[PDB]
Each structure stands twice: as C-alpha cells, then as structure tokens.
C-alpha cells in the first residue's frame, strides 16, 4: 500500500539512511553475555578457577535481541571485563580458555589443561584493559540456532530427560575456562563480565520478540500464572 | 621503535567499537553458510511487516490476553459512535508495544516514514458497515465527535465490502525524525491520534452475530526509517535468567 | 594474506572492513557496500486470496553446494510428495489455538513416514493447506501461521521457579496437533501479535475459507532427523473468536491438508519411529 | 609521536594470536634444511592412513593389550550372527581412540567427511567364510538382527576370497561437520554403528584353526577434514613429568 | 578406495577447508613448555635466579604434539608469563638470558654473566605484558628431535651412563636463565611460566601418538605395570 | 631488508607472514599459499602385494646441496650394497614381537659393518626383506613395521618412579634383535595401533608370506655414526597371533633379509665397534 | 607488534587536541541538515555586525 | 587516535632488539671516518688467521 | 486418514458445486475385465 493511495501527498526528497538497522549495526554492540564470580570465600568459584557453558542466552538484553531471529551465524568479538566486585582494578593476572567441545575442561586451577597447547588461551592482567579476541562462527551448523525445535539424540523421550528439548548441540561451542594464572589462590575476589560484540552477522526467519521475562538459559520458558501483555495498558479502548 | 603517542581514548572498552580484535583460532574456517530462508539483512523488513496491534490493549486477564488481537465493533444507534482510540506512536508504551515495529522501535530512539495500521473486518460476509478511522495529526486531541475527527487524515472503511483497509498514519512531523513519545516532555513526538469510528453502523441481518471484531495488522511503509539504536524498554527482565 | 574465513564469506554482500590478521574473522564488522494438485492428490484454493510462498522461497531440492551428506538421497517424489489430510480441530468458540510440528505431523503417515523412519535425514519443504469451511453467517479469524523452530516453553511451574521442559506428547504431538494452553505467547513466551513476521495467512471467514501456506525447508542444516528435529510449527490460532447463532453449524473442523514439497531422504538404515 | 589508540585486546597474550615477535639472536641463520623423507605438511596426511582401530577394546590386562588390536572370527551356527560392533565416530571414546585418525581427532573439535575401516582378515588360506559389515546411520540403534542391520550402509565381505576389505563409513551427518559425539547430547553428532555380521559363516576344513581374527584399520578418506584445533581429551597427563 | 567405489553416491560440492590442520594452525597455539619457581624461601630457586635447561617434553600437552613427529624444524614464539604463586602483578624486573650451550650459566644473581654483552637477555618488568621473543630454529641439525634412537658419545655404553641415550645434543638449545636484577634479594616469590608457539613449522616423520603417561622428560619411559590401553573400554565386543 | 633465515627457507611452500625486523623467523606464522636383486644378492617378492617404499622415497646416495662433510665419501655399491640375511626368529603363538635397530643390525656383518666401524660417517637407506613362510593351514599376521628414531623406553620400574634407561643390549641389540617386553606400547609408551603411519608392511600368512619395506636415510643430518645412533627399528609383531592345528609346522621362522641401498661412508679412520 | 615508542605527550588530555576518537554509534546517519537562515561560518561576521 | 593494539613483547628490553631509537643530538654529525688500515668487516676473518 | 493415502481431491462444495473425481487408470493389466464378487476381482479398479 502507498501513501498517495491514501492522502493528498508533496514530494519528500528523503536521505535518511537505513544503514542502522543493518544486522551489523544493530548486533555489532558488546553486550553482557556471561558474569564470572571468582571470589574469595563461597561455593561459587572457590578454587580460583571457573569453566563457564557458552550461552549468551543467560543475559537477558543480549537474548531477547538475538532470539528476534532464529538462526544467526556471526563472528563475534568477545570482550572479557575483568575486576573485583567492587570494580577495583587490582594487580592479579589471569588464563582465559577458550575449552572447546571435547577438549579438557579444568578441573582444578593447577590443572593440566592450563598448559594450552592447543587450546586458545589469553593472559590479561586485570590492570591491562580488557581482553578482547574475535571468536569465528564455530558451529557445525550454518548457523547458530536459538530455538531448536527438538532433541539431539534419539530415542524415547522420556520426562526424565526433557531437558534435552531445545538443546542445540550445534550451539555449544564449549566451555569459557578462567583462572588465576598461580599454584596459590588468588590475593583478590574476581568479577570477569564477559562482552561478546557479534560482527559479520547474518540472521535468518525473524521471529516474535520475546514479551515474557526469560527463566532459564536453554528453554523459553514463561512464568505460567505471571504471563504479561506484551505492552502496557489502559482503562478503555475509546480513552487514551 | 616509531614514535607513538596515545590518546585519550586508550586502553577504553567502548562496546560499540567496531574494531579488530585477535583471533582466537589462525585458521578456522567456519562451516560453510549453507542457503536458509528468511535471510534478513536489515530490521526494517520487520518492520514493514504487519503485526497485530493490541488497540484492544484493556484486558490484562491472563485468561483474556488473546482478547488483546482484537476490538468489538457492534451494532450501534447509528451516530458517529467511537469504536476503538490509540495513539499512533509506535515506540510508545502501548497499543504498538504488541508490533514487531513498536519491540524493533524499542531497540532505536528515533523513527522517521509512515506507518500502516491494516485493519480487518472478521464478521461475517453478511455483516456490513462503514468504519471511520481517522488519524489525527499530533495537534489535535481525542476528537469527541466523528465530525472533530474527519478533519483529520481518515479512510472511510466499508468492512462489509473491503475486509481490509489499511490506514496509512503519514509521516506527518515538525521533525524529520521521531523519537518516542512519552507522557511527558517527549509528547512533542507524538504521531497523533487513531481513532475508529463508527461511519454508519455495524449492519447485520437475521442469523449473522451482532457483534465482531477488527484486527489492527500495524506495520511502517518503505519509507521507514529508525536510528540511534539503544536498548529497549518495551521489555524489562525482572527474574534472574537461572 | 588473509583466510577468506568470516561469517559472511558465502554471502553476496560485499564488505568494507578493517582487518589487521591473517583471519577475515578477526576484521571489524565494518559497512555493507484454482486446483493444486501434488502426488495423486488435490486440493482447492479459490478462496484463499493467495497462496503465501514462506519467505519467498519455494522449496526446491537440496542444492549440491549445499549439501553435506555424500549419500545419494532418495527422492520418491509421488509417493511422498502429496497432500496428506491430518484429522481435524473442530473450532469452538472457546477455541485457544492449536500447533503442528514438522515433519512430526506425518513421520507416522504414508511413504512419507516410511521414508522418515528408514532414513536418518531428511528433507522437505512444505505445502500446508488450512482450510476452514464456515457459512457466511459464521464469523471468526484464523492465524494460520508457519513459527520455524517452534520450541514450547512450559509454565515453568506457573510461578516460573521450576525449570519444567514440554513432555515429547507437547513438543512433538504427531499429527493430532496440540492444542495451545497460552496461544497469546504462543506456550513459548513470545507474542502470537508478533506472529505474522512469519509465514502467516489469515483464515477470515467471511473472506477466505482456507489457508495455503507453501513453507520451504529451513533449517541451518541441508538435511536433519525427521524424528528428533522439528523443522516448523504450524500454528492455527483463533485471533478472532469464532461466532454464530444459535441455529448455525456448530462443528466448524479445521482440516489440515499437508504436502511435503521436494522430499529428500539420505542416511537409509532400519525403521526407526523416533 | 603519532597519535594513537589502545584498543580492549591491549597487553593480552593469547596464545594462538600469530604476532611478530622481536628476534633474540640479530642476524643468526639456522642450518640449512636438508631433505629428509616424511615430511607432512598438513595433519590429515595422517588421517588418511589406515591405523588399527580396537573393536576388542575389552581385554584392559597388561599381558592382554595386544588382544584389543584384533577380534575373532570363529565357527557359527550358521546365523546372521554378531561378530563385532564399534561406533563409527572417530574422535570418541572407544574403539577409535587406538587410530591416529582418532588421536588426531582429539585436538580437533569438528571433523567432516568419509573414514574408511579396513578389516583384514588373517585367518588361514583355507579359512572362508562371508561377513556382513554393517554401517548404521546415525538414528538406527544398535541392530537387534543381521536383518536388521544390511537396511544400513553395508559390505558383503568374503574373507576367503579377499583378505582386506574395506568398509567406507559414508559421510552422512545434518550438519556440515560433527562435533565428536559423547553419551550424552552430543550423541546428536554420532556417526552411527558399524556391526560386523556373519553373512554365511567362519567355514573352515580339517587342520586349520577353526577361529580367526580380524584385524579392523581405521582411517580417513580424502574429503575428511578437521577444524577447531583443541586440547586433546584422548591422553591425560596423570603423573607429573620429573 | 572410493565411496561410490562403496555406496550410491551423490554430488557434493566440498569447500571444507584443511587449513587448520597444517603444521602451523596445529603447532602455532602458545602452550606451557616450562615454569620456572623464583621463591623466596625454599629450595627450588631460593637465591632470586633460575637456570632452566630447555626443553619443551616437561609439560605433556606441548610435549605430545610435538612427539606426534619425531623431526621438527620451526622457529618457536617464545612468551614468558610471569606472575607470583598467586597470580599477582608485581613491580618486579627480571631478566630473562637465553644462554646458548657453551655460553657460561650464571652461578648466582650477581654473577657475570648477566651482562649478556652477547647472550640475548630480555629485561622486562612483572607489569609490563609477558615478555614475548622469536626464538629461530637454532639446530645444528636440520631439525629438532624428539626421538634420538642413539647415544651422543662413543664408548663402551655402560649402565652408569645409560641415561646419554636419547640424549640429542642437537636438541639441547641451551638454558634459559632467569633471574631477578638486583643485587638484593626480591620482595616477592615469582613464577615465570614459559609458552612457546612454534612458526614456520616444518614436521617429519609421524610416529604414534604416546598413549602412556609421560614420566620423564629426556626419554620415552612409560609406566610397566600401569600400561593403560589407548582408549577407553568396554564389556564386550557386541554391546556399546 | 630482511635475512632470509626462517625455518622454513629452504622449503618449497610460500608464506605469507607479517613481520617487522630483519629477521624471517621473527615474522609471523602466516598461512600458506619377482626377483629382486642387489649386489651378489637375490630375494624373491612374488607373494608380497607391493613393496613398501617408504614414505615414497627411494634410498638416494647424499644430494651435494644436502651434505655437509667435505670429505669424499666411499660408496662401496656392491660389497656393501647387498642383501644381508639375519638370524631367524621362530614366530610362536606366544611371540610378543621383535625390533631390530638400523644399521646396528648390520654394524657387525659383511664389508657394511667394516665400512660402518671404520668410518665416523654413514648414510644408507634399506631394502628390508622380512619373510615367514606359512602353509595355508596356518593363521597369523604380522606388521612388519620402520619405526624411525625407535627410542626404547623402560618399564620405569614397573611403578613409574624410577628413571630407568634401556641396556645397551636393549637399544642395540644387533643382528640377533631384541623381543618386545610390551608390543602394545613398543617399549617406547607409543601404541602399535597407529605404527602404520610408519613404513609398514602386513604379512599376513594367507595373503603374503613376505614384507619388503623399501626405507630412505631418515635424519636430521646427512650423514651419522652407524655406531651410536640408530637411524630406525624395525619392528616385526604378531597383532593377529601364529595359529595351527597340531600337526602342522610348529616352527614358523621369521628371517630377516636386508639390503642396505646406497650406502656412503665418509670420516676414515680406524675401525671403531662402538 | 609493530615496533612503536611512546612519546612524552601519551595519554595527555589536551582540550584543544584535535584528535579522532572511537564513534559510540557504528552506523549512525544524522538527521540530514535543513537549510536554517543566518548560518555563521566564522565570528568575524559577528564583528562586523 | 589511531587505534593500535599492545602484544605480549610490550615494554621488555631485548638487549639484541635491533630497534630505533631516540637520538640524544638531533643534528650531530660525526668526525668523518678517516681510513684506517686493518678493517674488519667479519670476525671470520680473524678465524682465518 | 487412510483414503487420503490414495487418490484423492479436496472438495470444497460451497465454493465450487461440481469437483471431477477422475479415477486414474492404474492397473496392472492393460485392460481391465470387468471385476466380480470371485476370481475377477483381481480386474477391480479399487474404491471411491
Ligand atoms: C581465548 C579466550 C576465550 C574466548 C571465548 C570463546 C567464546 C566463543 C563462543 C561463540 C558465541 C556463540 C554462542 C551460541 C549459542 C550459545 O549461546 C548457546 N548455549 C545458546 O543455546
Ligand atoms: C632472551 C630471552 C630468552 C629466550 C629463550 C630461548 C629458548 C629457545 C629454544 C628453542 C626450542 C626448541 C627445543 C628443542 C628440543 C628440547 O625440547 C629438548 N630438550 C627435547 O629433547
């Protein structure tokens, strides 16, 4: 439909750009995808190590934008902000392992799989600013996959493990391993926030923006009673 | 080594910094990028792409949440009766929160072009009526009469004829972009008013239901645009992501 | 100087960027720049007001660039590709909508579900007939609508602290469909309102009696399981509540007439049902 | 000096960044390369070659290792009996770990493309018989028949007649690549089953032995590739290295 | 052999590229290759310097990569990260000497030879980045060797010096001297960690991949009554 | 601007690397762009499918842009170049394995091991006949295997802890070789699952009754003492073990027959064992 | 790296430094510039006012 | 400014780094080098004595 | 949902008041002999 099959219409010489709503420009943000606690005391990360399960989907801001679309397949440029949970810049150096699918995952902060031989590691201070590498798209797939609809595996899909439904193996691109580089625990309570800014994006079969508070990192799930309009609300549809 | 000297901006996280950073792996290639359907390269695709608008956005009941999509036009005493109110701003907290346009508006703060609000006669083929929806360009307040309201931009809509129309809300702005009303200071970015109206009556015969619905299908035209890309507020995350 | 090995190396987009390694991974994200009849069945869409083609696409075979798998797959191409009629929803006035899940609709039905079951992979678009005969005195709309990857969500509990997962009757419910507890996020937590940015046809009663959604194969993989992967949801939403008096056809059944389009099947070894 | 910007990535070491390093010896040439045979250029010349894949990965004795590199063969009823069955993934725990395909696919996390396992039969001149070497694809379990199991990809193998054969595990996978298969999700990127059958029977005459063994050699073919080089999960370092 | 040789076969046009598992893409990840103790008290290191013999077989994730050859020519990226047991940054300025075989190793902290008027040395501070050099491929062979089936010397060989076989001279590229410079002893316990990335990596002769757990680092010693298998096991030949 | 002085100079492959000095290795990684007779000598090679040429190279005498000593070295070409028969090793059901070290197999016998003690310097390749006649009523196979560089590792103690060496009778065994203690590891903690990757040959007794792996000079260097160092082993194992019904031959022997192929010697002085 | 040395003015923030600094919006386009009556170029059309 | 990135060789001394550095006499020239007899260029030439 | 694995049309009645059910010849014989309750059934042309 047009506007002069609607109104009376002037010529409008219009420049205005639709470069910013290129998937580059809306994706090519850093984003919060992962906060690492090393701290001192606590069952949290206690040994001075920590193996985070890549999923950019536990942060909500960075999720709702990429399960506009389905499938994505990007380059992404991870940024790990590295500091004291009271942002404190302190002086303690640390190993970032990129733990693929199927390589070692650290057991331990001495662990063997430290000596990253293959593995792709940074060594960034927390005085250094913060660690930054692009990561390729990895996956098997074309893309990476949001929604999977269905298992990986076959057989009988029992309750016990439905939890298995939506898990894309095809996304798990492995295990984000930080530690402090030391056979001694560390001097400093750590807070690594990960930033992943995608870049060469390509994004395909948009789907509904998320209108529910997400609950958990692999499903999308919703609050059953607690299911909010999409917007907000009004008295009448004849008032404002 | 070469004289350098650094500048203010060293050693910064900018997070919209499009710069190179290292490879995390020297020669990776990636999986080949196999055809998918759908491909989107840019965001205004989404939003030239007609969605429903809620501009029955009263009923909160979770049980009545699917009464949202859709609004009552009935058999009225034949007056110029107003049918159904919303504001014609697409970033706004309410009848567009429910568009792909409005969640895609809530990623940017400024839009510029026309948008497309179809609406959907879903009576029967024996209902038959003519509907006056009128925008209101944003000086204008609510119209109190259908009279106030065809002043303003309007599409006589005969649903019992055409199932569809589509009101085109025309970029009429002071400013050649918009950035998101608000109840408030920002209210100079107002689109202005929608407002259906009732042109002569819902007319049905023996047998047919005496009341139906509209479907609002909201999009923007080609010649929409959005900038200045920030983070929404149209969804707020509440529960920790467990 | 450089591994040509970006994301968007395969695409036909050019891009102007920064690169300062051997990998274009590493580089900035830098700027750009009527009856139809398959098989030995057919079906009728002169009230339809068209057919929508998903995405633009049809669904062609898999494409030899394309493909990974070396074995040759089959294609019985008559026997498979056909229009496949599920059993019916009847329409209420209380209707909340209902989903179908591809291929898992007809991995129990015809060839077709033989050829699911004896091979691993699987390939197919889809030609989904939705067709809803009312009177003209019936009112009602339809979101007939094709969500690609539609995984459920649960309730979670209902007060979102249990981390349930939709049981395999929920997220695969064969061809009788499931119906939607909560079709206004679409049991997923996303907006049946935002629906229509996928391939979507509206049943409007008083317009249109059926809907012909043609759906291509989409999936980031050239082929997958037919058993485990569901490839669409189709959803059948009641946006519009059905209407009448009292006199009127009641029953007003939803039909679900299925054409696999293209069907493509490799990795042949025993039947397997799931 | 020349105005200049530390970006985030500043002062890290990653470890597979490919920097210029300075040089700690000025202008120190090394010894001239001379020819020496085996030179591999690429880690999938190693693939290619057909190391011994342990199907009898069962006898863990010490004095029993060499029992894994081969398995037997023997007189049947004369059934589609089940001689020997191994999962047809490289880079999983099991029978693939004795290759060097497999090893090597332990500091890959993705590999793509055709393995082929020669089976080598090395019975007596005398001994004869026909086996069924199944390959399932990936969604077939583990074949409760013969019958069941030539609906995969199969080879009828007289070992009397030819004393190698080889079963070529197609590639035959959703995705371009798989990410080697574990018991547990990762058993979506399962290759399948290979199940060795006896299609007629280990028929033997007087004097010689009435069981045999066959020796399986596993490897690649030359549209097999790897990518994302990782640490290896196939060999642990358990006792520090003094 | 073919797989149409095999089975019914289609057309697949493969762009799968082999370019990460070339000698480079496989050998130029930085692994650990040594970790040197600097304590304060103790009996590692205790007087502030540190006389590393190198050799890449100390750390087994390196040393099983590079005995996949048993001939590798490369020059080597040499990175030393240095830190304290815990991992702290510290205001430490060591020296890092390569002494090359023949060259004199320095005896103490305040010895001579820390004057590296011809040793390469690297002077670099805890809070600078991981003093990082390029080391060339230094062989008086052609390459290095990992297995040298022989004895360096003539002679009777004699179970008091069996410990000469393997030895390859052509491998033993001298020390890597480490100390902290000052004629004082420092305030702080360090531990520089070595990683080496390989480049321009030239590779003979593939060998089996060591199934055993390494022992010790000059010889190929596995232990004779924990002999593991290769791989992992199961009940029977049959069953999975 | 630059010394050419990377590893990879002298090779054939061309970089594309970055670098900043004046130094090559400095730069970056980069990425890329029958009877058979010798001597007085005579095998016979009927019943064994192929001979192995290992790693495709055949034993060249030294290439002059390959050499490093200056002095002229002897190529005897006959005297020495010759088939060299070993002592037998009876193939059991129990036979674990042999290896034999080259050329310390070959140091002791014939003009070849007056050649190899009385020059520093040796280069030869091999021609390595490994033949075990079996009847057709025995089973069995053999990889006969060239494991270059074959350091002989210990049991360590058995535990682990201790750093034991191998014997000089264990890394050198001469003529008669040395039996694996642990074929499955080689004695070298390295599994004979992949050994294949060596220069290997399968005897196994339906198909073949001989091996013939046709080995180059494989070193570092040009030229090596025949003395210390052993340029390879070869290793002789019964994966698939000696079968027979009793009555038929239990002595099943495996001679091995070799050929050092071009040998050259250079450093002249006196005869030296070891 | 590529060999470089810091100068003495490195991470100085002069007021005045016309310098390049990292954009905050990767592909922003402005709203295109309206013609406005009474545009100054330099202040000394204000001094001869 | 110009945005540069540090690598892991930052800030270290390498005594046998062939590097520019800065000149502590910005115009000097110096004496002109008169000929001297026994020039050695190479320390080869001494092995050959 | 087993007549619909055969030859079939979707018949909207309402929307178009005569469909044409052609029964295709699919036979295994050239000629069909008139098909009877017995030993001729074999000549059936199957069912509508
Ligand atoms: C060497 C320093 C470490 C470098 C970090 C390496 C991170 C690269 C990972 C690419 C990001 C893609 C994540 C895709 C899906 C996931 O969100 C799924 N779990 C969602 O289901
Ligand atoms: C000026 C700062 C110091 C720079 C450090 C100089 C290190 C260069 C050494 C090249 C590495 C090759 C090691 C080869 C064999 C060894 O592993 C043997 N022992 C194995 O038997």
Chains 1, 5 share one sequence.
């Not at chain 2, 005493?77 to 109110?85: D, H, I, Q, T």
């Amino acid at each position: 439909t047009s506007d002069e099959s609607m109104i009376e219409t002037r010529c409008v010489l219009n420049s205005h750009s639709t470069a910013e709503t290129t998937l580059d420009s809306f994706f090519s943000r850093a984003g919060l995808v992962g906060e690492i606690d090393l701290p001192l005391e606590g069952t949290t990360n206690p040994n001075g190590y920590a193996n985070w399960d890549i999923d950019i989907t536990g942060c909500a801001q960075m999720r709702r934008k990429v399960e506009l679309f389905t499938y994505m397949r990007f380059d992404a440029e991870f940024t790990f902000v590295a500091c004291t949970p009271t942002g404190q810049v302190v002086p303690q150096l640390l190993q970032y392992m990129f733990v693929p699918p199927g390589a070692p995952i650290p057991e331990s902060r001495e662990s063997l799989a430290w000596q990253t031989a293959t593995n792709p590691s940074v060594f960034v201070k927390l005085t250094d600013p913060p660690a930054q590498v692009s990561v390729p798209f990895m996956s098997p797939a074309s893309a990476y996959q949001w929604f999977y609809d269905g298992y990986p595996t076959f057989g009988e899909h029992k309750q016990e493990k439905d939890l298995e439904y939506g898990a894309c193996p095809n996304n798990m691109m492995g295990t984000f391993s930080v530690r402090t580089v030391g056979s001694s625990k560390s001097k400093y309570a750590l807070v690594v926030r990960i930033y992943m800014r995608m870049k060469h994006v390509r994004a395909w079969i948009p789907r509904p923006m998320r209108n529910q508070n997400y609950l958990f990192k692999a499903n999308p799930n919703y609050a059953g009673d607690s299911i909010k309009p999409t917007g907000t609300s009004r008295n009448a549809i004849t008032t404002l | 080594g070469f004289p350098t000297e650094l500048k203010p901006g060293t050693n910064q996280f900018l997070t919209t910094d499009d710069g190179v950073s290292a490879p995390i792996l020297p020669n990776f290639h990636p999986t080949p990028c196999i055809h998918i359907p759908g491909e989107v390269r840019n965001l205004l695709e989404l939003c030239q792409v007609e969605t429903i608008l809620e501009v029955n956005n009263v009923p909160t009941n979770a049980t009545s949440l699917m009464e949202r999509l859709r609004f009552p036009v009935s058999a009225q005493a034949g007056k110029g009766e107003l049918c159904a109110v919303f504001r014609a701003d697409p970033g706004r907290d309410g009848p567009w929160q429910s568009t792909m346009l409005g969640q895609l508006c809530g990623y940017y703060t400024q839009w510029s072009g026309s948008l497309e609000v179809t609406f959907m006669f879903t009576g029967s083929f024996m209902a038959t009526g003519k509907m006056l929806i009128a925008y209101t360009p944003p000086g204008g307040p609510l119209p109190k009469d259908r009279a106030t309201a065809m002043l303003g931009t309007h599409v006589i809509w005969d649903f019992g004829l055409q199932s569809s129309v589509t009101l085109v809300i025309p970029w009429i702005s002071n400013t050649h972009y918009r950035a998101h009303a608000r109840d408030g200071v920002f209210d100079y970015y107002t689109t202005g008013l929608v407002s259906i109206w009732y042109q002569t009556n819902y007319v049905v015969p023996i047998g047919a239901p005496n009341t139906a619905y509209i479907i609002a299908l909201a999009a923007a035209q080609k010649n929409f645009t959005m900038k200045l890309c920030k983070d929404t507020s149209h969804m707020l995350q509440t529960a920790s992501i467990q | 100087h450089e591994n040509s090995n970006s994301a968007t190396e395969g695409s036909t987009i050019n891009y102007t960027t920064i690169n300062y390694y051997k990998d274009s991974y590493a580089a900035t994200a830098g700027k750009q720049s009527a009856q139809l009849t398959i098989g030995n069945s057919t079906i009728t869409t002169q009230e339809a007001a068209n057919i929508i083609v998903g995405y633009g696409e049809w669904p062609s075979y898999c494409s030899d660039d394309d493909a990974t798998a070396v074995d040759k797959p089959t294609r019985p191409d008559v026997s498979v590709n056909r229009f496949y009629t599920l059993d019916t929803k009847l329409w209420e006035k209380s209707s909340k909508g209902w989903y179908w899940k591809f291929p898992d609709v007809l991995t129990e039905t015809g060839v077709f579900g033989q050829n699911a079951q004896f091979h691993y992979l699987y390939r197919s678009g889809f030609c989904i007939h939705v067709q809803c005969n009312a009177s003209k005195f019936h009112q009602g709309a339809l979101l007939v609508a094709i969500l690609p990857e539609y995984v459920i969500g649960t309730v979670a509990g209902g007060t979102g602290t249990e981390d349930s997962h939709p049981p395999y009757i929920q997220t695969q419910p064969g061809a009788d469909g499931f119906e939607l507890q909560h079709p206004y996020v679409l049991d997923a937590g996303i907006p049946i309102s935002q629906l229509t940015v996928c391939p979507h046809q509206w049943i409007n009663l008083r317009t249109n009696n059926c809907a012909t959604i043609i759906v291509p194969y989409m999936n980031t993989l050239p082929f997958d399981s037919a058993l485990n992967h569901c490839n669409f949801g189709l959803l059948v939403v009641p946006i519009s509540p059905l209407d009448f008096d009292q006199g009127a056809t009641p029953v007003i059944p939803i039909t679900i007439t299925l054409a696999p389009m293209c069907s493509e099947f490799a990795g042949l070894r025993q039947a397997v049902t799931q």
